Structures are given as C-alpha cells and as structure tokens.
C-alpha cells in the first residue's frame, strides 16, 4: 500500500502545482514533465482489485484522480495531445472502478461540479475510446444517484451530451456505455426525458436500437435502447410528431416481438412502452389491434414480474376499451 501512497502523492503534488499556476493569473505545468501517465496507469490497474480499492479509498484516491482529470481538462481542453488523452482514459477507468457500488465516491464526484463539466466535455473527444470510458463513469454516477447528484448530473447537461454522443459512436462498446448511462438518467426526472426527445434524430435512433444486431451475442444494446424508450414513452404519448417517428421506423411491431424475449428486461420495457402508446390515440390502438396485440398482451397478464403484469394489463385495458369501429362484427 505504500506504492499506492507514493503514486497518489505524485498526483496531489502535480495538481497543487497546476492550481498554483491557475491562481497566479512559472510556466504552464505539463503532465509529461511529471510522469503522470504512468502513475495513473498503475492506479487504474490496482483499482480493479477489491482489496486495493479499499486501500485507495483510505487515501482519498477517488478525490485525487478526479482532481487530476479536472485540472488537465481545464488547462488543455479538447485541444490537447495524446499524452493528455491517455492520462484521461486511465483516470476515467479508475473513476469507473472507484464509483462502482460506492455511495460515498459517487456523492463526492457528483459534488465536484468542475470535474463533472470536464467529464461531460470529453464525450466530444477525438478518442471514441475516451468517450466510452467517460460514459462508463456517468453510468455509475447515475445509478442510485441521491438528490444532489441527480441535480448536478442534469445541470451539467449530461443527458443532451450523451444522446448527441450516441448518434456519432461507431463501436458497440461505446454505444453500450452511452446507452446504459442514458437509461439510468432517463428515469431521474421528466426534464431528462424531454431533453432526450428534443435531440434531433434521437427517437429514430433509439427505435433503431430495438433491432440492434450484436456481434458479441448479447442483448445489452436492445435492453438499454428499449429501457430509454420506455422511460421517455410517457412524453412521446403526448406528442403526435414523436409518435409518428416511432410508427415509421416500425416501432410498434418490434415492441410486440419483444414480448416473446427471454429477457424479462426486454419484455418489461416493451410492456411499459405499449402501456403509454396504447393510451388515447385511436390509430395506434387500431394498428396494435390489427397486429394481434390483444392476445399477445393477454399472455403476460399472470407474470410474476410486477411491471410486466401491470404494463401488459394496462395496455390490454386501453385496447379492450377502444375496439376499433371496423371490428364491431363490422362497421
């Protein structure tokens, strides 16, 4: 543990020298001249081990690594070199590991508003790998976030930045982290839901994730994409333009097909989405009737899973109370 203690001292000393340069306004400190990259690389690697993490927390490892990432972003911005990119990647990975399951660490990092702004800015880095790392941090922070953390996550603009980021990522690994963070954020409040729906192209993109073809034989993208959609579907139900985006990217039929998934996550998401979209709109009701939605939702009403049971029943009630004019034996 005194290797760890030594590396953290290196990082704190470097930060202090950066803070002195900032407050002066001594040349501008350069992380390369203080061998910062190796120091954070090693800490990042130790952060994967549970015992080493606990040692690291006694030394305020989270605080110090966050302070380093923050000060480097402030000093050099996104007009930074590969040394800086690398440093931020390794710092970001450590922050991901240190925030995982850790109530105190999540609260500390979300209280660091400057650091939070720095993190969000990194979603436009030239390194898509760095975007994935930062989205992994934001995912942990948005999971079981307290009231102050929810407030800071929203006020630093993480939702719009993550949704915009999602539209530009190429790799499935980046998309998974980005969509997972958005799924967590989309449950926090109604403003987060509105901010997602307001990004041009987001609703169509999200519908596209419902039929994602994973190379890695997993459902992660479909689950998160569908979870985001279920969370924002309350507002989509109020906006005819947004409903139309869903219709013309084949959202309704795909949601009915999700009701057969082995993933209870996929089934629950789809039931929740169908619950909200089956309300009021007679043309969406008729479309669902015509696709056999009634018997499909009826098959799920005795689920042990509380949300599948309630959602499937609620959707069914909406349809049964609004049998289309054409069905009435006819006419």
């Amino acid at each position: 543990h005194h290797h760890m203690l030594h590396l953290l001292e290196q990082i704190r000393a470097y930060c202090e020298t950066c803070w002195e340069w900032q407050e002066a306004h001594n040349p501008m400190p350069a992380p390369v001249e203080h061998q910062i990259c190796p120091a954070v690389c090693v800490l990042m690697k130790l952060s994967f081990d549970e015992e080493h993490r606990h040692a690291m927390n006694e030394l305020g490892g989270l605080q110090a690594i966050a302070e380093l990432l923050q000060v480097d972003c402030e000093m050099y911005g996104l007009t930074n070199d590969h040394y800086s990119i690398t440093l931020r990647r390794y710092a970001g990975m450590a922050l991901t590991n240190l925030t995982f399951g850790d109530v105190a660490n999540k609260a500390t990092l979300c209280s660091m508003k400057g650091c939070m702004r720095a993190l969000v800015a990194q979603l436009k880095s030239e390194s898509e790998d760095l975007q994935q790392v930062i989205a992994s941090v934001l995912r942990n922070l948005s999971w079981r976030a307290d009231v102050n953390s929810k407030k800071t996550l929203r006020e630093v603009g993480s939702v719009k930045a993550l949704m915009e980021c999602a539209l530009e990522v190429k790799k499935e690994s980046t998309l998974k982290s980005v969509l997972s963070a958005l799924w967590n954020l989309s449950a926090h409040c109604t403003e987060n839901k509105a901010d997602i729906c307001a990004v041009d192209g987001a609703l169509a993109f999200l519908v596209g994730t419902l039929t994602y073809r994973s190379q890695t034989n997993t459902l992660a993208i479909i689950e998160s994409g569908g979870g985001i959609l279920r969370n924002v579907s309350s507002l989509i139900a109020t906006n005819e333009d947004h409903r139309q985006i869903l219709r013309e990217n084949n959202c309704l039929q795909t949601l009915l097909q999700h009701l057969k998934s082995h993933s209870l996550t996929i089934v629950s998401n789809a039931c929740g989405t169908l619950w909200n979209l089956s309300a009021r709109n007679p043309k969406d009701q008729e479309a669902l009737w015509d696709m056999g939605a009634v018997s499909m939702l009826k098959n799920l009403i005795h689920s042990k899973h509380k949300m599948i049971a309630m959602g499937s029943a609620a959707a069914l009630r909406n349809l049964m109370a609004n049998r289309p004019a054409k069905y009435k034996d006819a006419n």
């Binding site: 994967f48 990975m93 991901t96 590991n97 925030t99 995982f100 399951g101 790392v133 992994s136 995912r139 942990n140 999971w143 079981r144 969509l179 997972s180 963070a181 799924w183 967590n184 689950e223 998160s224 979870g227």
Partner: peptide
Amino acid sequence: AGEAAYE
C-alpha cells in the same frame, strides 16, 4: 441499466 466495473 445498473453499474459495472470498467470493461
């Protein structure tokens, strides 16, 4: 979506 370690 939950939380996870870096991967």
